[PDB]
Amino acid sequence: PKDEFQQIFVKDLMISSEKVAHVQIGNGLEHALLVLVKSGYSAIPVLDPMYKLHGLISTAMILDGILGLERIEFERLEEMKVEQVMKQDIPVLKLEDSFAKALEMTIDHPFICAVNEDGYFEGILTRRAILKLLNKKV
């Protein structure tokens, strides 16, 4: 169904931004880690006050940030901020980007942020959505 494939855009597959937790660059890592755990997301966007996308922060990035020689150094979280561990060079698609473009991006990126023309955060596009679509069709 190439009509289907070529008429399915990023916006049709994405989870909308209102269903996605976020933090800001100056939030503490204890705050961020709690938001991650409470939300059940393994990663969440870092946004500015205009709800523009700055980067992503994951539970992996947080724990790597406190990886000691002999233990995960959780006492350090109280002193750290989101800015110190977030990833700025992240996968981003526009609402109108193609299914083809997303499928390709999802090979190395478990999730991808969608933004509009003006860089406002609009949602996230997961591997599951691509796979769920591919599963039935094939």
Added chain:
Amino acid sequence: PKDEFQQIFVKDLMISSEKVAHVQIGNGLEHALLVLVKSGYSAIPVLDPMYKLHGLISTAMILDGILGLERIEFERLEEMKVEQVMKQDIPVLKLEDSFAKALEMTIDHPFICAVNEDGYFEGILTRRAILKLLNKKV
């Protein structure tokens, strides 16, 4: 390439077990969380002394296990074991299972353990491998 699809089995796509970190049911959660973080896996198998698969443990399961009202309660990890948070009802495929069966399983399970006839752990099958294969072909 249906010859391709029907001649690609779980064993052809999986990451072999020697490249995958593991723990045992009586390991401490500080030990398990360090192994998870150090390995870069978001989940790892829990094995018995015969290298048979008992369950999976993820960083999510660990942190959920110490989720307090106001903070992630890391001081609790010292007192807990892998058995208290692991998932026993997990996705498992045999080495000879089909690509079709794996693709379908990966829609809801980001990773799936492969076992042999006798339940020995043999490897893990990720979403990326399914997607990487699907990306080129389609």
